[PDB]
C-alpha cells in the first residue's frame, strides 16, 4: 500500500516468474542425472547448480532495495525475509574460501572413511556396508568395540581440528547476520514474528525441546531398563544392572536408532510380525498396483488423484533413493526402485504423501511452496505409512485375511519395534543438538568438548563410552549430519508433530480403540482437517498451520505418549523386578 511495498510486490512478481522458469529447468537436469547417471548428465547438473545459485545471489542483491520495516503485507515480508538473508556472503573472500575448504574436507573425510585390519592392512572396511554390518549383527563385544573405536579414531580424530575452525567461522557468519551464534542461526527456522497470538522466539525452541524431553523421560527410562536386561543376556558380564548402556552395543555406529536391537529384545519371538509381501506376490501385484492403491487411499479422504503427468513422467521401477519431486508447472513425480514388498508398499504411501503436500500448496508464491517448517514434510509422510500398515487397512484392501484379529502379544511386539526406532532416537537427537548448541554458544570450552559430550551421553541418553576419549577425538563429527553441516533437531520436532497429526486425524475419523491401530481411510473429515494445513505451505506461521490440524499452537508430546501407552503399561510390569534409570558412574573400562 506504500511505495516501497508496491515496488516490493512488483519485484517479487518478476522474481517468482524467473525462479519458476529457472528452477524447472534446473529440476529437469536433476531428474535426468538421478534417473540416467552419465557424465553428460553430471555436467548439465553441475552447470544448472551454478546457474541456480548465482541467480538467487543476484535476486538477493535486488531484494535489499526494499526495507522490511516499510512492508506491512506479511506474505510479502516472508518472501523478502528469505531473499534478503546474506549467509556466508558476510564473510571476507578469504574466510568464505577457508570455510568452503573446511566444509568440503570434512565431508570428504567422512565419505572416504575406511578402517583396515590391524593384522592385514590391505583388508579395509568402509562405513557402508562393512562397519554398519558389524554394528548391526555382531554379537562379538570386541569386534563391535574395534569397529566403534576405529571409526572414531580414524575419522573423528581427523575431523577434530577442522571442526574447531568450522565453529569459529560459522559463528562469525552467524553474528554478522545478526544472530547470537550458529546455533541461534539454525533455530531461526522456527522463528515467528509479527503475528499476534502466534509468535515463536528462537530461544523458545530450547525450552520446548527440554520440557517435552522431560515428559518422555519416564517412557524412555522404562524402555532403556527393558533393553538393558535383554542386553545383559546378549552380552554376558559386560553390562551393569545399574549402569548406562555401552555405546558400541546399540545396533548401529552411534546408537542413533535402536532398530537392530529388535531380535535381541523381541518380547514374544514365537509370534511373527505382519508381512503381506507373500500376499502381494500371490495376488500378482506390481509397482503400478502399489501406487494405484496409494492413490485410492488419498482419494478416499477427499484428496485429489495423481496428475496424468505423474503417471507418464514418474520412474516407479528400476539413483534408487526414494524421492518425491515437485518440479513446478504442474509437474509432480516420484522416483522409486519399487519392489513387491510391504516395505515399498509403505514407502509408496510415504512418498505420495509428499506429493499431496506439494500439490496442495502449488498456488503459493515460489519461496512459500515449502513445508510450514523443516519438520512438517516428513511428519506428513510418516502418518501416511502409519495408516497403511495397520491391520484394519490391510484387511480393507484384501492383503490380510478377513478373519484376522491382532492379539495381545503381536501388538506388544509391534509397539516395541516402533519404540526402538521412534523413542530410542529422541534422547539421542536432543542430546546431540544440545551439545552443538552449547558449543556454538561458547558454553563448552575446547579442552572439555569430549568430556562434556560423554557427560551428556551418560546423563541424558543413558549411554557410556566403552573406552576413554581425550580431546584429540571428535566423536560428534563421526556422524554424517555433524560433519556435513546439517541441523539435527528436525528429527525431534518431526517425531512429535507426526503423532500430533495422527491423533487429531484419528479423532476426526472417530477412531475407536488405541491410537496405533487407527486408519484414517475413507474419512473425508480427516482429509479436510489435513488439507487445511497442507494448502498453506509456508505462507502462515507454523504455529498457525499446526493449529489448523490439531487445534493447538505448539509442539506437544502427549500424543506420542498416548500412542505408546499400551507398551508403557507392559514395560512397567516387565520392569517391576529391575532397576529403572541408570547411574552415570559406571563405565566398561573402570
Amino acid at each position: 500500500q506504500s511505495t516501497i511495498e508496491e515496488q516490493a510486490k512488483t519485484f517479487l512478481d518478476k522474481f517468482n516468474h524467473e525462479a519458476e522458469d529457472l528452477f524447472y529447468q534446473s529440476s529437469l537436469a536433476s531428474w535426468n542425472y538421478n534417473t540416467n547417471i552419465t557424465e553428460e548428465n553430471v555436467q548439465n547438473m553441475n552447470n544448472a547448480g551454478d546457474k541456480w545459485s548465482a541467480f538467487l545471489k543476484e535476486q538477493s542483491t535486488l531484494a535489499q532495495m526494499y526495507p522490511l520495516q516499510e512492508i506491512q503485507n506479511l506474505t510479502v515480508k516472508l518472501q523478502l525475509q528469505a531473499l534478503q538473508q546474506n549467509g556466508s556472503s558476510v564473510l571476507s573472500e578469504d574466510k568464505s574460501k577457508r570455510l568452503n575448504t573446511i566444509l568440503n574436507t570434512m565431508s570428504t573425510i567422512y565419505s572416504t572413511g575406511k578402517v583396515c585390519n590391524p593384522d592385514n592392512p590391505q583388508e579395509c572396511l568402509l562405513l557402508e556396508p562393512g562397519l554398519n554390518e558389524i554394528m548391526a549383527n555382531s554379537l562379538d563385544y570386541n569386534e563391535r568395540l574395534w569397529a566403534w573405536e576405529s571409526w572414531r579414531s580414524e575419522v573423528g580424530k581427523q575431523l577434530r581440528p577442522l571442526y574447531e575452525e568450522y565453529v569459529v567461522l560459522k559463528n562469525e557468519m552467524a553474528r554478522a547476520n545478526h544472530y547470537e551464534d550458529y546455533g541461534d542461526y539454525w533455530r531461526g527456522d522456527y522463528e515467528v514474528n509479527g503475528v499476534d497470538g502466534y509468535d515463536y522466539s528462537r530461544g523458545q525452541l530450547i525450552e520446548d525441546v527440554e520440557h517435552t524431553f522431560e515428559e518422555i523421560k519416564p517412557l524412555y527410562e522404562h524402555l532403556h531398563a527393558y533393553v538393558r536386561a535383554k542386553l545383559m543376556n546378549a552380552y554376558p558380564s559386560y553390562i551393569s544392572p545399574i549402569g548406562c548402556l555401552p555405546a558400541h552395543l546399540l545396533g548401529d555406529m552411534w546408537g542413533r536408532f535402536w532398530t537392530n536391537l529388535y531380535s535381541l529384545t523381541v518380547p514374544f519371538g514365537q509370534k511373527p510380525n505382519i508381512d503381506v509381501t507373500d500376499a502381494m506376490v500371490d495376488q500378482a501385484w506390481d509397482a503400478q498396483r502399489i501406487f494405484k492403491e496409494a492413490e485410492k487411499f488419498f482419494v478416499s479422504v477427499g484428496l485429489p488423484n495423481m496428475t496424468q503427468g505423474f503417471w507418464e513422467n514418474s520412474m516407479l521401477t528400476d539413483v534408487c533413493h526414494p524421492t518425491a519431486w515437485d518440479l513446478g508447472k504442474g509437474d509432480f513425480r516420484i522416483l522409486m526402485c519399487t519392489k513387491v514388498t510391504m516395505d515399498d508398499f509403505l514407502t509408496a504411501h510415504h512418498e505420495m504423501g509428499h506429493i499431496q503436500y506439494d500439490m496442495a500448496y502449488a498456488a503459493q508464491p515460489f519461496l512459500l511452496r515449502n513445508g510450514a517448517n523443516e519438520g512438517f514434510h516428513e511428519a506428513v509422510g510418516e502418518i501416511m505409512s502409519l495408516s497403511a500398515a495397520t491391520p484394519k487397512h490391510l484387511k480393507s484392501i484384501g492383503l490380510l485375511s478377513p478373519d484376522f484379529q491382532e492379539d495381545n502379544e503381536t501388538e506388544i511386539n509391534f509397539l516395541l519395534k516402533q519404540a526402538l526406532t521412534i523413542v530410542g532416537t529422541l534422547p539421542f537427537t536432543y542430546m546431540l543438538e544440545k551439545w552443538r548448541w552449547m558449543v556454538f554458544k561458547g558454553e563448552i570450552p575446547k579442552d572439555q568438548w569430549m568430556k562434556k559430550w560423554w557427560e551428556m551421553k551418560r546423563e541424558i541418553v543413558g549411554v557410556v563410552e566403552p573406552v576413554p576419549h581425550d580431546e584429540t577425538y571428535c566423536d560428534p563429527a563421526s556422524l554424517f549430519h555433524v560433519s556435513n553441516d546439517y541441523s539435527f533437531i528436525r528429527y525431534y520436532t518431526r517425531t512429535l508433530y507426526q503423532f500430533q497429526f495422527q491423533e487429531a486425524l484419528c479423532q476426526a475419523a472417530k477412531h475407536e480403540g488405541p491410537l496405533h491401530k487407527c486408519d484414517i481411510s475413507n474419512s473425508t473429515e480427516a482429509g479436510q482437517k489435513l488439507f487445511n494445513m497442507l494448502r498453506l505451505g509456508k505462507s502462515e506461521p507454523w504455529t498457525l498451520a499446526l493449529e489448523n490440524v490439531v487445534g493447538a499452537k505448539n509442539m506437544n508430546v502427549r500424543p506420542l505418549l498416548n500412542y505408546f501407552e499400551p507398551l508403557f503399561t507392559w514395560l512397567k510390569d516387565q520392569n517391576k523386578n529391575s532397576f529403572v534409570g541408570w547411574s552415570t558412574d559406571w563405565s566398561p573400562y573402570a
Partner: peptide, 13 residues
C-alpha cells in the same frame, strides 16, 4: 537435488 530455498538451494545427490 535443487530446492526452493535461499539457505540450501543445492543438496548433494
Amino acid at each position: 537435488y535443487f530446492q526452493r530455498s535461499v539457505r540450501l538451494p543445492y543438496l548433494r545427490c
